[PDB]
PDB file of C-alpha atoms (C1' of nucleotides) and ligand atoms in Angstrom:
ATOM      1  CA  UNK A   1       0.000   0.000   0.000  1.00  0.00           C
ATOM      2  CA  UNK A   2       1.372   3.410  -1.101  1.00  0.00           C
ATOM      3  CA  UNK A   3       1.664   6.388   1.280  1.00  0.00           C
ATOM      4  CA  UNK A   4       3.758   8.959  -0.613  1.00  0.00           C
ATOM      5  CA  UNK A   5       4.827  12.017   1.459  1.00  0.00           C
ATOM      6  CA  UNK A   6       3.944  14.118  -1.560  1.00  0.00           C
ATOM      7  CA  UNK A   7       2.487  12.942  -4.909  1.00  0.00           C
ATOM      8  CA  UNK A   8       4.927  12.575  -7.798  1.00  0.00           C
ATOM      9  CA  UNK A   9       3.224  14.658 -10.489  1.00  0.00           C
ATOM     10  CA  UNK A  10       0.310  17.062  -9.886  1.00  0.00           C
ATOM     11  CA  UNK A  11      -1.378  18.441 -13.010  1.00  0.00           C
ATOM     12  CA  UNK A  12      -2.907  21.587 -11.563  1.00  0.00           C
ATOM     13  CA  UNK A  13      -4.161  22.526 -15.064  1.00  0.00           C
ATOM     14  CA  UNK A  14      -7.787  22.303 -16.117  1.00  0.00           C
ATOM     15  CA  UNK A  15      -8.379  18.858 -17.592  1.00  0.00           C
ATOM     16  CA  UNK A  16      -7.243  18.223 -21.160  1.00  0.00           C
ATOM     17  CA  UNK A  17      -9.633  15.243 -21.456  1.00  0.00           C
ATOM     18  CA  UNK A  18     -12.400  15.974 -23.897  1.00  0.00           C
ATOM     19  CA  UNK A  19     -15.546  17.694 -22.608  1.00  0.00           C
ATOM     20  CA  UNK A  20     -18.910  17.888 -24.396  1.00  0.00           C
ATOM     21  CA  UNK A  21     -17.532  20.817 -26.325  1.00  0.00           C
ATOM     22  CA  UNK A  22     -14.691  19.128 -28.156  1.00  0.00           C
ATOM     23  CA  UNK A  23     -16.104  15.625 -27.974  1.00  0.00           C
ATOM     24  CA  UNK A  24     -19.065  16.275 -30.223  1.00  0.00           C
ATOM     25  CA  UNK A  25     -18.024  18.728 -32.940  1.00  0.00           C
ATOM     26  CA  UNK A  26     -21.000  19.550 -35.181  1.00  0.00           C
ATOM     27  CA  UNK A  27     -24.082  18.131 -36.787  1.00  0.00           C
ATOM     28  CA  UNK A  28     -23.973  16.919 -40.364  1.00  0.00           C
ATOM     29  CA  UNK A  29     -26.025  18.341 -43.166  1.00  0.00           C
ATOM     30  CA  UNK A  30     -25.632  16.448 -46.488  1.00  0.00           C
ATOM     31  CA  UNK A  31     -28.668  15.013 -48.191  1.00  0.00           C
ATOM     32  CA  UNK A  32     -28.228  11.703 -46.368  1.00  0.00           C
ATOM     33  CA  UNK A  33     -28.262  13.246 -42.950  1.00  0.00           C
ATOM     34  CA  UNK A  34     -31.202  15.486 -43.843  1.00  0.00           C
ATOM     35  CA  UNK A  35     -33.110  12.418 -45.028  1.00  0.00           C
ATOM     36  CA  UNK A  36     -32.301  10.641 -41.768  1.00  0.00           C
ATOM     37  CA  UNK A  37     -33.525  13.639 -39.784  1.00  0.00           C
ATOM     38  CA  UNK A  38     -36.760  13.674 -41.772  1.00  0.00           C
ATOM     39  CA  UNK A  39     -37.675  10.016 -41.894  1.00  0.00           C
ATOM     40  CA  UNK A  40     -36.432   8.098 -38.878  1.00  0.00           C
ATOM     41  CA  UNK A  41     -35.523  10.803 -36.295  1.00  0.00           C
ATOM     42  CA  UNK A  42     -31.785  10.103 -36.331  1.00  0.00           C
ATOM     43  CA  UNK A  43     -29.400  13.027 -35.887  1.00  0.00           C
ATOM     44  CA  UNK A  44     -25.970  12.727 -37.448  1.00  0.00           C
ATOM     45  CA  UNK A  45     -23.012  14.341 -35.629  1.00  0.00           C
ATOM     46  CA  UNK A  46     -19.350  14.532 -36.545  1.00  0.00           C
ATOM     47  CA  UNK A  47     -17.418  13.842 -33.330  1.00  0.00           C
ATOM     48  CA  UNK A  48     -13.848  13.360 -32.076  1.00  0.00           C
ATOM     49  CA  UNK A  49     -11.990  10.225 -33.177  1.00  0.00           C
ATOM     50  CA  UNK A  50     -11.742   9.292 -29.516  1.00  0.00           C
ATOM     51  CA  UNK A  51     -15.432   9.462 -28.672  1.00  0.00           C
ATOM     52  CA  UNK A  52     -17.117   6.278 -27.333  1.00  0.00           C
ATOM     53  CA  UNK A  53     -20.814   5.497 -27.747  1.00  0.00           C
ATOM     54  CA  UNK A  54     -21.435   6.130 -24.048  1.00  0.00           C
ATOM     55  CA  UNK A  55     -19.478   9.342 -24.192  1.00  0.00           C
ATOM     56  CA  UNK A  56     -21.331  10.564 -27.274  1.00  0.00           C
ATOM     57  CA  UNK A  57     -24.656   9.792 -25.599  1.00  0.00           C
ATOM     58  CA  UNK A  58     -23.606  11.763 -22.531  1.00  0.00           C
ATOM     59  CA  UNK A  59     -22.545  14.688 -24.709  1.00  0.00           C
ATOM     60  CA  UNK A  60     -25.844  14.675 -26.545  1.00  0.00           C
ATOM     61  CA  UNK A  61     -27.723  14.625 -23.209  1.00  0.00           C
ATOM     62  CA  UNK A  62     -25.707  17.578 -22.000  1.00  0.00           C
ATOM     63  CA  UNK A  63     -25.611  19.639 -25.173  1.00  0.00           C
ATOM     64  CA  UNK A  64     -29.303  19.413 -26.084  1.00  0.00           C
ATOM     65  CA  UNK A  65     -32.734  18.351 -24.829  1.00  0.00           C
ATOM     66  CA  UNK A  66     -32.033  14.987 -26.448  1.00  0.00           C
ATOM     67  CA  UNK A  67     -32.673  11.472 -25.166  1.00  0.00           C
ATOM     68  CA  UNK A  68     -31.025   8.856 -27.407  1.00  0.00           C
ATOM     69  CA  UNK A  69     -32.241   5.245 -27.729  1.00  0.00           C
ATOM     70  CA  UNK A  70     -29.299   4.014 -29.734  1.00  0.00           C
ATOM     71  CA  UNK A  71     -26.076   5.433 -31.126  1.00  0.00           C
ATOM     72  CA  UNK A  72     -24.225   3.923 -34.030  1.00  0.00           C
ATOM     73  CA  UNK A  73     -20.810   5.291 -34.870  1.00  0.00           C
ATOM     74  CA  UNK A  74     -18.206   4.965 -37.548  1.00  0.00           C
ATOM     75  CA  UNK A  75     -14.740   6.409 -38.237  1.00  0.00           C
ATOM     76  CA  UNK A  76     -14.736   8.479 -41.402  1.00  0.00           C
ATOM     77  CA  UNK A  77     -11.733   8.443 -43.685  1.00  0.00           C
ATOM     78  CA  UNK A  78     -11.316  12.177 -42.894  1.00  0.00           C
ATOM     79  CA  UNK A  79     -10.307  11.380 -39.338  1.00  0.00           C
ATOM     80  CA  UNK A  80     -13.658  12.142 -37.730  1.00  0.00           C
ATOM     81  CA  UNK A  81     -16.210   9.890 -36.048  1.00  0.00           C
ATOM     82  CA  UNK A  82     -19.719  10.139 -37.499  1.00  0.00           C
ATOM     83  CA  UNK A  83     -22.326   9.197 -34.920  1.00  0.00           C
ATOM     84  CA  UNK A  84     -25.838   8.247 -35.996  1.00  0.00           C
ATOM     85  CA  UNK A  85     -28.067   9.007 -33.020  1.00  0.00           C
ATOM     86  CA  UNK A  86     -31.598   7.527 -32.958  1.00  0.00           C
ATOM     87  CA  UNK A  87     -33.837   9.546 -30.623  1.00  0.00           C
ATOM     88  CA  UNK A  88     -36.380   8.059 -28.198  1.00  0.00           C
ATOM     89  CA  UNK A  89     -39.993   8.220 -29.436  1.00  0.00           C
ATOM     90  CA  UNK A  90     -40.866  11.138 -27.150  1.00  0.00           C
ATOM     91  CA  UNK A  91     -38.723  13.522 -29.231  1.00  0.00           C
ATOM     92  CA  UNK A  92     -38.975  14.722 -32.819  1.00  0.00           C
ATOM     93  CA  UNK A  93     -35.501  15.057 -34.323  1.00  0.00           C
ATOM     94  CA  UNK A  94     -36.931  17.663 -36.693  1.00  0.00           C
ATOM     95  CA  UNK A  95     -37.969  19.901 -33.801  1.00  0.00           C
ATOM     96  CA  UNK A  96     -34.602  19.350 -32.137  1.00  0.00           C
ATOM     97  CA  UNK A  97     -32.881  20.051 -35.472  1.00  0.00           C
ATOM     98  CA  UNK A  98     -34.761  23.348 -35.656  1.00  0.00           C
ATOM     99  CA  UNK A  99     -33.761  24.162 -32.084  1.00  0.00           C
ATOM    100  CA  UNK A 100     -30.088  23.512 -32.776  1.00  0.00           C
ATOM    101  CA  UNK A 101     -30.160  25.283 -36.136  1.00  0.00           C
TER     102      UNK A 101
ATOM    103  C1'   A B   1      -3.867  38.476-113.949  1.00  0.00           C
ATOM    104  C1'   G B   2       0.508  35.451-114.887  1.00  0.00           C
ATOM    105  C1'   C B   3       5.595  32.874-114.303  1.00  0.00           C
ATOM    106  C1'   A B   4       8.747  29.447-111.458  1.00  0.00           C
ATOM    107  C1'   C B   5       9.622  21.250-112.583  1.00  0.00           C
ATOM    108  C1'   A B   6       9.955  18.667-107.970  1.00  0.00           C
ATOM    109  C1'   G B   7      13.514  16.426-104.776  1.00  0.00           C
ATOM    110  C1'   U B   8      18.769  16.421-102.860  1.00  0.00           C
ATOM    111  C1'   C B   9      22.948  19.701-101.507  1.00  0.00           C
ATOM    112  C1'   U B  10      24.972  24.691-100.271  1.00  0.00           C
ATOM    113  C1'   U B  11      25.093  29.763 -98.713  1.00  0.00           C
ATOM    114  C1'   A B  12      22.756  34.227 -96.562  1.00  0.00           C
ATOM    115  C1'   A B  13      18.572  36.646 -94.228  1.00  0.00           C
ATOM    116  C1'   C B  14      14.422  35.946 -91.035  1.00  0.00           C
ATOM    117  C1'   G B  15      12.089  32.547 -87.664  1.00  0.00           C
ATOM    118  C1'   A B  16      11.221  27.577 -84.661  1.00  0.00           C
ATOM    119  C1'   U B  17      13.701  23.905 -81.328  1.00  0.00           C
ATOM    120  C1'   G B  18      16.766  23.773 -77.368  1.00  0.00           C
ATOM    121  C1'   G B  19      18.952  25.886 -73.064  1.00  0.00           C
ATOM    122  C1'   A B  20      24.713  26.824 -74.107  1.00  0.00           C
ATOM    123  C1'   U B  21      27.245  31.538 -73.152  1.00  0.00           C
ATOM    124  C1'   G B  22      27.302  36.061 -70.281  1.00  0.00           C
ATOM    125  C1'   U B  23      25.371  38.606 -66.138  1.00  0.00           C
ATOM    126  C1'   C B  24      23.552  37.685 -61.449  1.00  0.00           C
ATOM    127  C1'   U B  25      22.954  34.777 -56.244  1.00  0.00           C
ATOM    128  C1'   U B  26      18.543  34.900 -49.262  1.00  0.00           C
ATOM    129  C1'   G B  27      22.980  28.650 -51.366  1.00  0.00           C
ATOM    130  C1'   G B  28      27.256  25.913 -50.636  1.00  0.00           C
ATOM    131  C1'   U B  29      32.362  25.189 -49.243  1.00  0.00           C
ATOM    132  C1'   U B  30      36.643  26.052 -46.427  1.00  0.00           C
ATOM    133  C1'   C B  31      39.180  28.284 -42.442  1.00  0.00           C
ATOM    134  C1'   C B  32      38.890  31.135 -37.799  1.00  0.00           C
ATOM    135  C1'   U B  33      36.499  32.293 -33.023  1.00  0.00           C
ATOM    136  C1'   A B  34      32.905  30.945 -29.066  1.00  0.00           C
ATOM    137  C1'   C B  35      30.422  27.767 -26.429  1.00  0.00           C
ATOM    138  C1'   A B  36      28.356  22.869 -25.855  1.00  0.00           C
ATOM    139  C1'   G B  37      24.288  17.430 -23.906  1.00  0.00           C
ATOM    140  C1'   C B  38      19.300  15.864 -24.212  1.00  0.00           C
ATOM    141  C1'   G B  39      16.515  12.148 -21.334  1.00  0.00           C
ATOM    142  C1'   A B  40      11.762   8.371 -16.134  1.00  0.00           C
ATOM    143  C1'   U B  41      10.742  16.321 -14.350  1.00  0.00           C
ATOM    144  C1'   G B  42       9.605  11.122 -20.357  1.00  0.00           C
ATOM    145  C1'   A B  43      14.711  12.666 -24.774  1.00  0.00           C
ATOM    146  C1'   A B  44      15.903  12.303 -29.926  1.00  0.00           C
ATOM    147  C1'   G B  45      13.027   9.809 -33.498  1.00  0.00           C
ATOM    148  C1'   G B  46       7.985   8.593 -35.230  1.00  0.00           C
ATOM    149  C1'   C B  47       2.789   9.189 -35.704  1.00  0.00           C
ATOM    150  C1'   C B  48      -1.743  11.895 -35.285  1.00  0.00           C
ATOM    151  C1'   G B  49      -3.648  16.480 -35.200  1.00  0.00           C
ATOM    152  C1'   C B  50      -4.183  22.247 -35.199  1.00  0.00           C
ATOM    153  C1'   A B  51      -6.122  27.875 -39.719  1.00  0.00           C
ATOM    154  C1'   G B  52     -12.701  30.982 -41.304  1.00  0.00           C
ATOM    155  C1'   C B  53     -11.783  29.899 -46.644  1.00  0.00           C
ATOM    156  C1'   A B  54      -5.552  25.459 -45.759  1.00  0.00           C
ATOM    157  C1'   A B  55      -2.408  20.672 -49.784  1.00  0.00           C
ATOM    158  C1'   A B  56       3.038  20.828 -48.935  1.00  0.00           C
ATOM    159  C1'   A B  57       6.787  22.846 -46.255  1.00  0.00           C
ATOM    160  C1'   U B  58       7.133  26.230 -42.029  1.00  0.00           C
ATOM    161  C1'   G B  59       5.214  26.875 -36.909  1.00  0.00           C
ATOM    162  C1'   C B  60       2.567  24.788 -33.152  1.00  0.00           C
ATOM    163  C1'   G B  61       0.029  20.734 -29.516  1.00  0.00           C
ATOM    164  C1'   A B  62      -7.122  19.851 -27.655  1.00  0.00           C
ATOM    165  C1'   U B  63      -4.887  26.983 -24.682  1.00  0.00           C
ATOM    166  C1'   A B  64      -2.638  23.620 -31.426  1.00  0.00           C
ATOM    167  C1'   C B  65       0.413  28.605 -37.907  1.00  0.00           C
ATOM    168  C1'   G B  66      -0.568  30.133 -31.327  1.00  0.00           C
ATOM    169  C1'   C B  67      -1.690  31.753 -24.959  1.00  0.00           C
ATOM    170  C1'   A B  68       0.575  34.704 -21.098  1.00  0.00           C
ATOM    171  C1'   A B  69       4.601  38.066 -19.974  1.00  0.00           C
ATOM    172  C1'   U B  70       8.327  41.484 -21.595  1.00  0.00           C
ATOM    173  C1'   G B  71      10.412  45.093 -25.708  1.00  0.00           C
ATOM    174  C1'   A B  72       8.976  47.354 -29.847  1.00  0.00           C
ATOM    175  C1'   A B  73       4.527  49.240 -31.280  1.00  0.00           C
ATOM    176  C1'   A B  74      -0.594  50.756 -35.909  1.00  0.00           C
ATOM    177  C1'   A B  75      -1.608  47.914 -38.552  1.00  0.00           C
ATOM    178  C1'   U B  76      -3.025  42.917 -40.718  1.00  0.00           C
ATOM    179  C1'   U B  77      -4.630  41.991 -45.547  1.00  0.00           C
ATOM    180  C1'   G B  78      -6.101  37.193 -51.385  1.00  0.00           C
ATOM    181  C1'   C B  79     -11.169  37.937 -49.408  1.00  0.00           C
ATOM    182  C1'   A B  80     -13.657  37.583 -44.732  1.00  0.00           C
ATOM    183  C1'   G B  81     -12.790  39.651 -40.143  1.00  0.00           C
ATOM    184  C1'   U B  82      -9.776  41.694 -36.060  1.00  0.00           C
ATOM    185  C1'   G B  83      -7.424  46.140 -34.246  1.00  0.00           C
ATOM    186  C1'   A B  84      -5.200  51.197 -32.848  1.00  0.00           C
ATOM    187  C1'   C B  85      -6.281  56.932 -31.937  1.00  0.00           C
ATOM    188  C1'   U B  86      -1.590  51.245 -25.855  1.00  0.00           C
ATOM    189  C1'   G B  87      -1.327  44.041 -21.786  1.00  0.00           C
ATOM    190  C1'   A B  88      -5.298  45.074 -27.900  1.00  0.00           C
ATOM    191  C1'   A B  89      -3.148  44.542 -35.074  1.00  0.00           C
ATOM    192  C1'   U B  90       1.812  42.888 -36.160  1.00  0.00           C
ATOM    193  C1'   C B  91       6.752  41.724 -35.006  1.00  0.00           C
ATOM    194  C1'   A B  92      10.755  40.287 -31.960  1.00  0.00           C
ATOM    195  C1'   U B  93      11.793  38.494 -27.047  1.00  0.00           C
ATOM    196  C1'   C B  94      10.307  34.309 -24.330  1.00  0.00           C
ATOM    197  C1'   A B  95      11.853  33.158 -18.397  1.00  0.00           C
ATOM    198  C1'   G B  96       5.170  32.115 -16.989  1.00  0.00           C
ATOM    199  C1'   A B  97       1.425  28.652 -18.613  1.00  0.00           C
ATOM    200  C1'   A B  98       0.707  24.658 -21.415  1.00  0.00           C
ATOM    201  C1'   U B  99       2.993  20.628 -24.148  1.00  0.00           C
ATOM    202  C1'   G B 100      -2.249  14.880 -28.200  1.00  0.00           C
ATOM    203  C1'   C B 101      -0.603   9.411 -29.188  1.00  0.00           C
ATOM    204  C1'   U B 102       3.833   7.163 -28.988  1.00  0.00           C
ATOM    205  C1'   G B 103       9.019   6.232 -28.545  1.00  0.00           C
ATOM    206  C1'   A B 104      14.380   4.107 -23.351  1.00  0.00           C
ATOM    207  C1'   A B 105       8.781   3.344 -23.000  1.00  0.00           C
ATOM    208  C1'   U B 106       8.399   1.361 -18.252  1.00  0.00           C
ATOM    209  C1'   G B 107       1.201  -2.509 -16.012  1.00  0.00           C
ATOM    210  C1'   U B 108       0.729  -6.858 -19.871  1.00  0.00           C
ATOM    211  C1'   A B 109       0.403  -6.309 -25.236  1.00  0.00           C
ATOM    212  C1'   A B 110       0.822  -4.823 -30.392  1.00  0.00           C
ATOM    213  C1'   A B 111      -0.732  -5.486 -38.285  1.00  0.00           C
ATOM    214  C1'   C B 112      -4.839  -4.698 -31.577  1.00  0.00           C
ATOM    215  C1'   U B 113      -6.458   2.422 -30.265  1.00  0.00           C
ATOM    216  C1'   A B 114      -6.792  -5.278 -27.128  1.00  0.00           C
ATOM    217  C1'   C B 115      -6.429  -6.135 -21.880  1.00  0.00           C
ATOM    218  C1'   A B 116      -5.458  -6.322 -16.504  1.00  0.00           C
ATOM    219  C1'   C B 117      -5.278  -5.047 -11.324  1.00  0.00           C
ATOM    220  C1'   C B 118      -4.861  -0.902  -7.266  1.00  0.00           C
ATOM    221  C1'   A B 119      -6.408   3.996  -5.931  1.00  0.00           C
ATOM    222  C1'   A B 120     -12.542   5.958  -7.659  1.00  0.00           C
ATOM    223  C1'   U B 121     -10.841  10.587  -9.518  1.00  0.00           C
ATOM    224  C1'   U B 122     -11.677  15.720 -10.521  1.00  0.00           C
ATOM    225  C1'   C B 123     -13.502  20.540  -9.946  1.00  0.00           C
ATOM    226  C1'   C B 124     -15.997  24.550  -7.251  1.00  0.00           C
ATOM    227  C1'   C B 125     -17.325  27.312  -2.751  1.00  0.00           C
ATOM    228  C1'   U B 126     -15.608  28.487   3.159  1.00  0.00           C
ATOM    229  C1'   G B 127     -16.983  21.918   6.086  1.00  0.00           C
ATOM    230  C1'   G B 128     -20.744  21.428   2.069  1.00  0.00           C
ATOM    231  C1'   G B 129     -21.976  21.432  -3.440  1.00  0.00           C
ATOM    232  C1'   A B 130     -21.130  19.739  -8.347  1.00  0.00           C
ATOM    233  C1'   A B 131     -19.385  16.695 -12.017  1.00  0.00           C
ATOM    234  C1'   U B 132     -17.259  12.950 -15.209  1.00  0.00           C
ATOM    235  C1'   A B 133     -15.429   5.019 -16.739  1.00  0.00           C
ATOM    236  C1'   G B 134     -12.686  10.105 -16.584  1.00  0.00           C
ATOM    237  C1'   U B 135      -7.801  10.622 -13.940  1.00  0.00           C
ATOM    238  C1'   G B 136      -3.501   8.835 -11.777  1.00  0.00           C
ATOM    239  C1'   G B 137      -0.446   4.385 -10.346  1.00  0.00           C
ATOM    240  C1'   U B 138       1.723  -0.685 -11.202  1.00  0.00           C
ATOM    241  C1'   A B 139       8.505  -2.701 -15.628  1.00  0.00           C
ATOM    242  C1'   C B 140      13.305  -4.491 -14.705  1.00  0.00           C
ATOM    243  C1'   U B 141      18.058  -3.727 -12.192  1.00  0.00           C
ATOM    244  C1'   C B 142      20.033  -1.140  -8.244  1.00  0.00           C
ATOM    245  C1'   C B 143      21.104   2.046  -3.557  1.00  0.00           C
ATOM    246  C1'   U B 144      19.875   4.074   1.516  1.00  0.00           C
ATOM    247  C1'   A B 145      16.260   3.766   5.195  1.00  0.00           C
ATOM    248  C1'   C B 146      11.889   1.245   7.343  1.00  0.00           C
ATOM    249  C1'   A B 147       8.626  -3.064   8.015  1.00  0.00           C
ATOM    250  C1'   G B 148       7.196  -7.601   9.957  1.00  0.00           C
ATOM    251  C1'   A B 149       7.934 -12.643   8.776  1.00  0.00           C
ATOM    252  C1'   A B 150      11.905 -16.554   7.501  1.00  0.00           C
ATOM    253  C1'   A B 151      17.254 -19.618   9.152  1.00  0.00           C
TER     254        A B 151
HETATM  255 MG1  LIG C   1     -18.994  -0.380 -35.805  1.00  0.00          MG
HETATM  256 MG1  LIG C   2      13.206  23.117-107.718  1.00  0.00          MG
HETATM  257 MG1  LIG C   3      27.501  13.835 -21.678  1.00  0.00          MG
HETATM  258 MG1  LIG C   4       0.594  38.285 -26.258  1.00  0.00          MG
HETATM  259 MG1  LIG C   5       3.129  44.989 -25.159  1.00  0.00          MG
HETATM  260 MG1  LIG C   6       3.784  -0.314 -22.473  1.00  0.00          MG
HETATM  261 MG1  LIG C   7      -3.822 -10.420 -32.536  1.00  0.00          MG
END
RNA sequence: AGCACAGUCUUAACGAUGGAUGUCUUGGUUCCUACAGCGAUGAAGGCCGCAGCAAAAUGCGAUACGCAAUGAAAAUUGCAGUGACUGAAUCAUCAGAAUGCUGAAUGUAAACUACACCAAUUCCCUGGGAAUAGUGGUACUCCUACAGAAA
C-alpha cells in the first residue's frame, strides 16, 4: 500500500480530457443526414476520433434536450467519427434540429 | 492576272527547337572564433492532429500557424474579419502557462487504439456542493532507510 509524502506529479491545469464541447463537434447536413432527420428521427453528428458510444450519448444529453435510444458510430476516412443518433420516441428530431439550427 | 519542274545539296537573311554563353545569387564550401548534452521532471526519433476559406513545407500541440509576460509598437490583408487613436493589429523576445498518441517506453500487449489489477478521480465554494469510466499508479536492475515474517 502506497503512502507517498507528496504525490509525484500534480497536473494543476484544467483537464485536457475531452468535454462535451470538443467531444461532439457539429451536426452533419448532407442530403443523407437530412433524409435521416426527416424520416427516422436520427441526428448525425461529426465527433472526435476518440469518442465512445457512451461518451457521445452523454454529450448529446448535456448539449441538447435529447434522449437517445441508440447510437451507431463509424470512423470516417477524414479522421472524424460520425455518430448516428436515434432519438427516443418522445422527441422529434426535426424539432430538435430546428432548435439547434 | 501570270511565271517558277519537284527532290537532294549549299550559302545568306528571317524565324522555330533547345537551353549553351554572359550577367547575377537569401545557397554551398573552407578556415577562424565561441560555447556545448538531451533524457523516467519522459529525450531524440515517429505518428496523429491544429487555420474561417488550408495541400506541402514552415510553426505549433485539444490553450494547437498560437496563450501569457516582456520590448517594440498601428496595422493585418487574397477575401472575410480583427485592431489602434496602448497588456489590444503585427513583429521580436520568451523566463510564466501549457505541451495529443507514442518512442528508453516502463502494467501486460501490439498489423490490436486489445487487456489487466490498485487507488474511484476531478472541480468549485468556506466543512458542504457539483461533475465525469474520466484521472492517476503498477517494468526491470540497483542504492539508503523502514517493516514484519523466515534460518
Ligand atoms: Mg462499428
Ligand atoms: Mg526546284
Ligand atoms: Mg555527456
Ligand atoms: Mg501576447
Ligand atoms: Mg506589449
Ligand atoms: Mg507499455
Ligand atoms: Mg492479434
